Curated annotation (Swiss-Prot), chain A:
Subunit structure: Heterooligomeric complex of flotillin-1 and flotillin-2 and caveolin-1 and caveolin-2. Interacts with ECPAS.
Source taxonomy: Eukaryota, Metazoa, Chordata, Craniata, Vertebrata
Name listed for the protein in its UniProt record: Flotillin-1
Homology family: Belongs to the band 7/mec-2 family. Flotillin subfamily.
Recorded superkingdom: Eukaryota
Length: 53, 50
C-alpha cells in the first residue's frame, strides 16, 4: 500500500511529461503555423486581386 | 489548436473573396465606360449614313 501511495506521485509527474507537455507543445506549433498559412493566403489574395485589376 | 487554426484560415478565405470582388468591380466598371464609348461613337457615325 505504501509502495502504491508513492506510485500516485509518480504518475502525476510522468503524465505531466508524457501527456501534457507535448500536447501543449503541439498547440503552440499549430497556432504559430496557422499565422503563417493565413499570412501566405492574404498575400496571395492581394497578388491575384492586383493581377485581375 | 484546431479552433484558432480554422478561424485564421476562414478569415483568409473571406479576405480572398473580398479582394477579388473589389478588383472585379473595378474591371466591370472600366469595361462598361469603354463599351459605352463604342456605342456612342458608332451611333454618332451611323446617324450620318446616306
Amino acid at each position: 500500500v505504501a509502495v502504491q501511495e508513492q506510485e500516485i506521485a509518480r504518475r502525476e509527474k510522468e503524465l505531466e511529461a508524457r501527456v501534457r507537455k507535448p500536447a501543449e507543445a503541439e498547440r503552440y506549433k499549430l497556432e504559430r503555423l496557422a499565422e503563417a498559412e493565413k499570412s501566405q493566403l492574404i498575400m496571395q489574395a492581394e497578388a491575384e486581386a492586383a493581377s485581375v485589376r | 489548436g484546431e479552433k484558432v487554426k480554422q478561424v485564421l484560415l476562414a478569415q483568409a478565405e473571406a479576405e480572398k473573396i473580398r479582394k477579388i470582388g473589389e478588383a472585379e468591380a473595378a474591371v466591370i466598371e472600366a469595361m462598361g465606360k469603354a463599351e459605352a464609348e463604342r456605342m456612342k461613337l458608332k451611333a454618332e457615325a451611323y446617324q450620318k449614313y446616306g
